[PDB]
């Protein structure tokens, strides 16, 4: 099998700038004078979309800002000028012979101005409490860059167990990230404590952003 | 316009069987070489099987890891490609895409989960704000389901912008995702906002309205 190895793993480019993504094959993909190397864009939650064929030739309807080069073992995909909708994972792929193989993908992030998260806090629902569970949820929405810290405090004391953090992929329109933080408790423990705090630290401010509720308000 | 629609994905126990089906239109089907490709977080994208046109004797090919187990075939009269999978392993779990003209065109895909765990419907909980500003943010928690996927929308897809639906995580062998939505406080609670959740695997379909606490 021909193994394809992409670099870099991810990459962050400002709007209107060049993004260059590479693909090295373990053996030559040249055959009958064509370099059989294809590139694909996978946007969040979508199937792969065909961009480039035969190393450098462009698929029907594909914007001119996408273009590839190379031969033999070393190939690359150039995107220029980059725009907001290009946030995606890009895969190289080889059709020289069976078995057909793909690279591991490269993540293209669109750079933008820093943005502090809009933070919201949500006690459990009445329905969830009547089932015997208690989930306290925090949304940290529309922030950049992706790196962020979320601290949970019960009555002022820090809490690390039961916490689960999920990030969205970068947004196609405004280039921000968003994130859910979910503290999962037994109802019995939830009802023991009064003050529930969600404390978000981010590049944008030295001071954390804090949202809180008290169990009975 | 090219279209590929896969169907027949779902849950199966290890060692079982399943038949995927791919209905293609918008191009000369009898000429197209068709393939199946799968995607998982562990393995990434793997090519699975190929079937070629009548001129290439309907030649089949397979990835080494599926030989003797998977069988690809096609009905040129109905523009359909089949994938018969036997003796399924957990490593065969993933999203299965049907592709036409080798990899020129791809379907939306269908999910295959190979596990002993049983189908479990989600519990769907509304999340209203704390009992002030310009916009306001609402939420919807979807907890304790298996297998993937669920689909979540707000007002049946009417409310698209200002929505963040977070990837599912595996909370001790059962999946949990949330979704947020942000609208102007003129909108809510003046208008009804409903979280719509579907879980094909268990025939679950739930609509939770979001309501104030006080």
């Amino acid at each position: 099998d021909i193994v394809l190895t992409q670099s870099p793993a991810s990459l962050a480019v400002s709007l209107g700038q060049r993004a260059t993504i590479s693909c090295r094959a373990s053996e030559s993909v040249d055959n009958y004078g064509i370099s059989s190397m294809n590139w694909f864009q996978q946007k969040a939650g979508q199937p792969p979309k065909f961009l480039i064929y035969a190393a450098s030739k462009q698929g029907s309807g594909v914007p001119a800002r996408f273009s590839g080069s190379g031969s033999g073992t070393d190939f690359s995909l150039i995107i220029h000028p980059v725009e907001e909708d290009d946030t995606a994972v890009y895969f190289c792929q080889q059709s020289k012979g069976v078995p057909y193989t793909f690279g591991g993908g490269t993540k293209l992030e669109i750079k933008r101005a820093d943005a502090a998260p809009t933070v919201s806090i949500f006690p459990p629902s009445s329905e969830q409490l009547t089932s015997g569970g208690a989930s306290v949820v925090c949304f940290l929405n529309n922030f950049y860059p992706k790196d962020i810290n979320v601290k949970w405090k019960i009555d002022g004391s820090e809490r690390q167990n039961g916490v689960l953090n999920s990030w969205t992929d970068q947004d196609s329109k405004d280039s921000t990230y968003s994130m859910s933080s979910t503290l999962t408790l037994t109802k019995d423990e939830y009802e023991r404590h009064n003050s529930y705090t969600c404390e978000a630290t981010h590049k944008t401010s030295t001071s954390p952003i804090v949202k809180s509720f008290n169990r009975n308000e | 316009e090219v279209k590929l629609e896969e169907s027949g994905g779902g849950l199966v126990q290890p060692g079982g069987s399943m038949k995927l089906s791919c209905a293609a239109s918008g191009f000369t089907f009898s000429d197209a070489w068709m393939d199946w490709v799968r995607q998982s977080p562990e393995k990434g994208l793997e090519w699975v099987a190929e079937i070629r046109n009548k001129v290439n004797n309907h030649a089949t090919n397979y990835a080494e890891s599926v030989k003797g187990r998977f069988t690809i075939s096609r009905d040129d009269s109905r523009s359909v490609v089949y994938l018969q999978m036997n003796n399924l392993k957990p490593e065969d779990t993933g999203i299965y895409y049907c592709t036409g003209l080798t990899f020129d065109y791809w379907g939306q895909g269908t999910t295959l989960t190979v596990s002993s765990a049983k189908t479990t419907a989600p519990s769907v909980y509304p999340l209203a704000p704390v009992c002030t500003g310009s916009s306001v943010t609402l939420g919807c928690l979807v907890k304790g389901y298996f297998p993937e996927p669920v689909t979540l929308t707000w007002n049946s897809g009417s409310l698209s912008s200002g929505v963040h639906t977070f990837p599912a995580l595996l909370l001790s062998g059962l999946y949990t995702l949330s979704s947020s939505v942000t609208v102007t406080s003129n909108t809510w609670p003046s208008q009804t906002i409903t979280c719509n959740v579907a879980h094909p695997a268990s025939s679950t379909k739930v609509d939770k309205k979001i309501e104030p606490r006080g």
Partner: peptide, 11 residues
Amino acid sequence: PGARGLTGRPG
């Protein structure tokens, strides 16, 4: 396209 597709195996 071809039969094989733009993405396919070389002739």
